[PDB]
Amino acid sequence: TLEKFVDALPIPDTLKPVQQSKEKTYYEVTMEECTHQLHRDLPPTRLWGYNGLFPGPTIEVKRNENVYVKWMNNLPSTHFLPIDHTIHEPEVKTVVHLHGGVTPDDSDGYPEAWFSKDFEQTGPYFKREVYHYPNQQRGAILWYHDHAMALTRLNVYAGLVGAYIIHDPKEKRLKLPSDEYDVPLLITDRTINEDGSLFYPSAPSLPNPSIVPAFCGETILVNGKVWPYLEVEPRKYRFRVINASNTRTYNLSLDNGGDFIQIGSDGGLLPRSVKLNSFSLAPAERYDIIIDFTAYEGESIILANSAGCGGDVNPETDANIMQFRVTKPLAQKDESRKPKYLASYPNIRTLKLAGTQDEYGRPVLLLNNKRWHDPVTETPKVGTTEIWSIINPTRGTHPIHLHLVSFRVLDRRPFDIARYQESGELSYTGPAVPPPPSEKGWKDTIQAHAGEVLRIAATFGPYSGRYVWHCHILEHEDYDMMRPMDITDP
C-alpha cells in the first residue's frame, strides 16, 4: 500500500472572476480531462477536473453577492469509467449542482438539465448556459459537483468536485480563524491501480458493466492527495470538512486525544459551539470546525477514521485520513477566537426508504417506492413549512439531501422493523431523541439511521419550481433513490 503522509496537503487556489462589479460577479469554469499525480510514488492519474484541477478551484463569495457561473463541458465524448446502460444521446453528460445553494430551479443542476461537450446536445430540462447564484443565505461551507442523470457516481468519482464558501461579513466580529488559517479539507476515497489509473468496479446474468450498490475505496485522499500531511503553526485553525466521497462515511478523531470545536454544519454556524472527541461525516455532509494546535507544538497528529466501509477499517489504510505536523513557526500572535455563542436562530409528510430488486436480481433503492420517472408526489407549496417523517426500515444509514432548503432536525425514534415490515405498523421501541448540539443548527444532508424515524422541519422557499431530493450515496442516488420535488406557486 502507498506510504502514508509523504505528500503535503494541496490548498486549492481560489477562483478569480472573469468580471466583477459592486453588484455582479461572473465566473467561468471548464470541465477538462487532465492528469495529476495523486501520490509521490504514482504516475499521473487521468482525471476529469473543473478547470482541469482536482479538486476544482475553491469559489469564495459574500452573502448576497450576485454570482453567475458559466459551467462548460470540454471533456472527451466517451467516458473512461464503466457505464451501466440498464439503469435508465451523448455518452458523457454533465451538469453542476451547487450543493446547499439557495438557488432558482433552472440554476440548481437538475439531473435532466445535462449538456455534452460545448452544449452540443442537452437534456430535456436544459435551459441556460450561465447559472445564477444569488447567495441570499447564511454563511456556510457549500460544495459543487456533477449531478448528471444516471452518471453522477461516475462523474464525481472522476474528479468533478469543488468547494464553495459563502462569507457573511456580519460574522467577522466573531474573529474565527481566517485567511491562511481557514482551510478546506475535501475528503475522497479512491481505488488506484498500480499504474496510477482510477479503478471503479464494473460489477457487484447481470448486465456488464453493472452498477454496484456501494463503493468503498482502498485509499483516502484529502484535497486530491493520498494520505497527505499538513504543517501547521501551534495555534487555532479553521477547517471546512467536506465529505466528497461516493459512499464512505467517516468517523473522525485525533490520535493525540485532542478535541474538535464544531462551529458550523451544512447550513451555517451552529447556535453554540460544541467540543467533540469524534464525529460522523456521511457523504455530502460538512463540518465547520476549529482545531487548536497551541498546546501541541512539535507533535505529529493523525486525523483518524474508525468507520467501516464494507468491513472494519484497516489500521494501515482507511483508518488514516491525514497527518498534522505542528512544526510551522508562529508567524504572528494568534488573534483568532473560539467563541461559544455563535448565532441566534428563531403540513406533515411521511416518506419510506426501501429497497426492491430488479429483473437481474440487483437491489434498487427507492424513495416512497417511487421511481425517478414516476409522476411527482412531493409537492409542497412555496412559503409553507412541513415536518417530514423519514422512515428507514433498511439495514443501513442513508444521508438524505433536500435541494434548495436547509432544515431543522426535530428528533429520531427507533421502531421495530419486523413489525413494520409486514403489517406496516409504526411501533416505537423507545422515546424520541432530540438532535445533539451538532444538529441543533441547520442541515441540508442528514443521516437517517436504520430502524429509526427521523423528523425534520423545512420551509420550502424562497423560490418555487422543480427541484429534487435524494440519498447522497451516489450509488444509491443513481439507482434509483432520487425523486423530483415541485415547490408549487399559485
Ligand SMILES: [Cu+2]
Ligand atoms: Cu451534493
Ligand SMILES: [Cu+2]
Ligand atoms: Cu444538493
Ligand SMILES: [Cu+2]
Ligand atoms: Cu442511500
Ligand SMILES: [Cu+2]
Ligand atoms: Cu442532489
